[PDB]
């Protein structure tokens, strides 16, 4: 991160340096290809850049890339002064969604936990206010 | 009193939705290139592991937030080449491709108005966002496009195609005014809906304190950041701040107090600095949680709620971009002069009383007529508009008259 | 916080036995003085932590609550707040320390494109829908509801009439089938 990518040889090695350097906003990417196309996201990295496996592709050579965003499929609607797109079906969905609502109870004794039996540690923490009661 | 006009009216409101990203190291704030501060400050536990924890979740939330209000659809439409929504002109909201970026008007004036160093020293790093400024453009373009050519339609299912007039007919036949009222007065209603769009850069020019909420974020990180590089200028009841003379006018037996005493006050100050930010991005998230309902339901449909979607009766909304936030302008629908009638709960024909389907009575002074709710048109009543329940007996404060009937061509 | 206890915290040591043995009474006093110190602001970091954590979770259930109130009792038409696509029902269930709805919706379906008209322009009267919208096949005319596709014949009973053909863009020309013909026999 914020390291250019000249001085990244200054710090099991050829993580260090070599094979393919990237240049990116975050900083260098080392053990990477940058393609020229889009894919959707993946493991992110940041600037609108991630970085997926997805090397299924002259041997296959499985090896990670690094790829810029896509914001979805492009689409564009036939709109005129008049046209009207009336259904004809229909399909019934469900749709799950989990929502949290409590989690476990807890309580932890003031006393105990920081002196055990020795009552001079007791006697020594009643110095203090009321810090085992708020 | 029965409205006789009305008036198309714009209203802006601006949401903040994401705070700078940033971490800060727990050893080299605190200790710099000296290994003897490192490895007394290993005494304590990981005082160091958990603060760096709470920064990169922070991070990682706000980063969340942001995706939140501007992917409800994975799907980036285009407006049509050619611009005839019968006489509506969306030139300030829609994107400018003459400008090399790639915003509109009034986000052009947005960004030019949240403008007000400290790139790296003692460990203090900002991270860049995972989306980018030219990504949240093409997300607002797209939900613009959507909503112009497809009214709510594309966000419950396939996009369906619709006329605008036809759409803002649509609009009007859901808080009481009927279909006709569009399809005389076109002409006006479009051109209250153009000035006042209009206005609305007029508007923002010219106050400074319109874009105030999204500024006081800004303003207090930065003074929370101040602040604690600040904190590093103080002996902390010891006899010297710099750890380097320290080390030399004095012994290895001895200099170990000063480093201790330095030790405890950064780390209370850095445990300050974090229980700020986690407060403060609470509160952020609750505005993002916020500003993305409203996103969902002002936006992708017409709303109902009262003063939710901007103030009075609630017509459309339009989403815009900024400096970490949104900005909606909210088109509503107010009444405007008003009339004075007399009124009577029902009319008494022979024997059966007449209740109206829709609308109520409103008597001009020697006649009477049937009308809406909300525009005042008069008609002559019929055994269409109203029907019969009961007897002339029990309501209260019913009136004589005559009701027409429609069926006397069959005399003939 | 259990491991936070093996921490000498600038001390001698961490048990507070061995303090208590190898030292005086009017010495061991620092090194009891210091751990009761880290524990004590240690425990406090612990405590903050949980209050910041249950402002969320009680966020959460009021949320929870909303939406078992609305979705569940009753039809809800707030866009996309219970299911994605048209509410229908919902259904709710049980889960360790949390709660699952199922919300089952309604969304269309293929679809055909058609031609429109604001209005029929009939004899000097101009006839509005009353529910639904003008579709043509392309040779006749029909008026249909805005979710699903059945045409029917236009008559007097679909149609409202107001006004004349002289104010509204775009009206076309058809024939307002009539329901009182057979009186005519
Ligand atoms: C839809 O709205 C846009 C934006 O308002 C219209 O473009 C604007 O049209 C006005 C028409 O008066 C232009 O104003 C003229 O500018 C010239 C050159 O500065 C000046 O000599 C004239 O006296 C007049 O003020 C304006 O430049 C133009 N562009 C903007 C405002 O960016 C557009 O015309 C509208 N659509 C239709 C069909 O009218
Ligand atoms: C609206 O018109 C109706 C009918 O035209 C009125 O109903 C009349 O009410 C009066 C008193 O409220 C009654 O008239 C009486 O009828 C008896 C029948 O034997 C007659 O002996 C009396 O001398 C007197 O005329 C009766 O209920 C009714 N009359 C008829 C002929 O229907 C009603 O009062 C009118 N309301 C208003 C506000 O003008
Ligand atoms: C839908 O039907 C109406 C009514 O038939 C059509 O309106 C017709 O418009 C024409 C010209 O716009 C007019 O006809 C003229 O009438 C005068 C009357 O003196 C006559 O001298 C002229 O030679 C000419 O026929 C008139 O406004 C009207 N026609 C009639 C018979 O009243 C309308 O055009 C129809 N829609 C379409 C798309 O054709
Ligand atoms: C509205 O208020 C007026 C004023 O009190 C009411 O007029 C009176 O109504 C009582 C009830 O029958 C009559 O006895 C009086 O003679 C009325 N006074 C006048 C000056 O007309 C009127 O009835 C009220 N309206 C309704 C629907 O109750
Ligand atoms: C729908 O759009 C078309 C395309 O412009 C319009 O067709 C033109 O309308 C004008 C206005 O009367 C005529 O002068 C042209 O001759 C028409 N062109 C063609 C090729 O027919 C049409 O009027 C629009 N309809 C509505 C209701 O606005
Ligand atoms: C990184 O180093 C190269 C070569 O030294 C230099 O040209 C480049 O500008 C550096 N990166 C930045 C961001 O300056
Ligand atoms: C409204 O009611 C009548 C009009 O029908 C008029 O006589 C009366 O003075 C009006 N009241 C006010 C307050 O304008
Ligand atoms: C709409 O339907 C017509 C046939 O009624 C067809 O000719 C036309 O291509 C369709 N439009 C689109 C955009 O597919």
């Not at chain 2, 969340?64 to 019968?86: L, M």
């Not at chain 2, 396939?158 to 195609?161: D, F, I, R, T």
């Given at each position: ?27 260098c990417?080392?053990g ?8 959707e996201?993946?493991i ?16 296959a ?5 690094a790829?810029?965003?896509?914001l ?12 009207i ?6 399909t019934?969905?469900?749709?799950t ?15 105990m ?6 009552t001079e ?14 | 009193?029965?409205?006789?006009n ?8 601006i949401?903040?939705?994401?705070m700078?990203k940033?971490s ?33 979740g922070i991070?990682?939330e706000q980063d ?23 006489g ?6 829609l ?10 008007p ?10 007000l160093?400290?790139?790296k020293?003692?460990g203090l790093?900002?991270?860049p ?8 453009a093409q997300?607002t373009?797209?939900?613009?496009a959507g ?10 299912g396939?996009?369906?195609?619709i ?7 649509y ?6 005014v009927?279909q ?13 809906f ?9 508007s923002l ?7 105030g ?11 929370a ?6 904190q590093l200028?103080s ?10 003379d ?7 037996p001895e ?15 850095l445990?300050?600095?974090?229980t ?8 952020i ?11 969902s339901?002002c ?21 815009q ?13 107010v ?5 004075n ?8 024909h ?9 609308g109520?009575?409103?008597?001009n ?6 009308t809406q ?7 002559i ?12 007996d ?19």
């Open positions: 991160q914020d390291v250019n990518c000249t001085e990244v040889p200054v710090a099991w090695r050829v993580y260090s340096t070599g094979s393919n350097v990237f240049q990116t906003r975050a900083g990417l080392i990477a290809e940058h393609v020229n196309n889009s894919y996201c993946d992110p990295i940041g600037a609108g850049i991630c970085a997926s496996y997805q090397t299924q592709t002259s041997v050579s499985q090896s990670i890339i790829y810029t965003m896509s979805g499929a492009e689409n564009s609607v036939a709109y005129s002064n008049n046209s797109a009336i259904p004809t079906n229909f019934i969905s469900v749709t969604e989990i929502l949290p609502v409590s989690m476990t109870k807890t309580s932890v004794d003031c006393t936990y920081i002196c055990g039996d020795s540690c007791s006697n020594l923490l009643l110095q203090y206010g009321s810090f085992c009661t708020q | 009193a029965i409205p006789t009305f008036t198309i009216s714009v209203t802006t409101e949401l903040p939705v994401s700078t940033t800060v190291d727990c050893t080299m704030y605190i200790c710099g290139d000296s290994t003897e501060c490192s490895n007394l400050l290993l005494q304590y536990g990981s005082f160091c592991t958990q603060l760096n924890r709470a920064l990169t991070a990682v969340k937030n942001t995706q939140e209000v501007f992917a409800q659809v994975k799907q980036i439409y285009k407006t049509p080449p050619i611009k005839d929504f019968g509506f002109n969306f030139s300030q909201i994107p400018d491709p003459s400008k090399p970026s790639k915003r509109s009034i986000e052009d004036l947005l960004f030019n108005k949240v403008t160093c400290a790139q020293f003692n790093t900002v991270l966002p995972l989306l980018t400024d030219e990504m949240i997300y373009s797209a939900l613009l909503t112009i050519t497809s009214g709510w339609t594309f966000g419950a396939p996009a369906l195609q006329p605008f007039p036809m759409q803002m007919a609009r009007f036949n859901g808080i009481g009927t006709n009222v569009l399809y005389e007065n076109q002409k006006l209603i479009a051109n209250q153009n000035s006042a769009i209009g206005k609305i850069q007029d020019s010219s106050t400074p304190s319109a874009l909420k999204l500024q006081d974020v800004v303003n207090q990180n930065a003074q950041l101040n602040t604690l590089v600040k200028s002996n902390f009841g010891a006899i010297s701040s710099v750890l380097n320290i080390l030399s006018r004095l012994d290895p200099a170990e107090v000063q480093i201790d005493r330095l030790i405890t006050g950064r780390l209370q100050s445990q300050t600095y974090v700020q930010q986690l407060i403060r991005a609470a509160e998230r609750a505005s993002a949680n916020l500003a993305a309902t409203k996103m339901e936006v992708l449909g017409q709303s109902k709620r009262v003063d939710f979607c901007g103030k009075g009766y609630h017509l459309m909304s339009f989403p971009s900024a400096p970490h936030g949104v900005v909606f302008l909210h088109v509503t629908y009444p405007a002069q008003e009339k009638f007399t009124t009577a709960p029902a009319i008494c022979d024997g059966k009383a007449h209740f109206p389907r829709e109520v009575f409103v008597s002074g020697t006649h009477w007529f049937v709710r909300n525009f005042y048109e008069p008609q009543i019929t055994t269409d508009n109203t029907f019969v329940s009961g007897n002339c029990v309501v209260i404060g019913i009136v004589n008259n005559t009701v027409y009937d429609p069926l006397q061509p069959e005399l003939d």
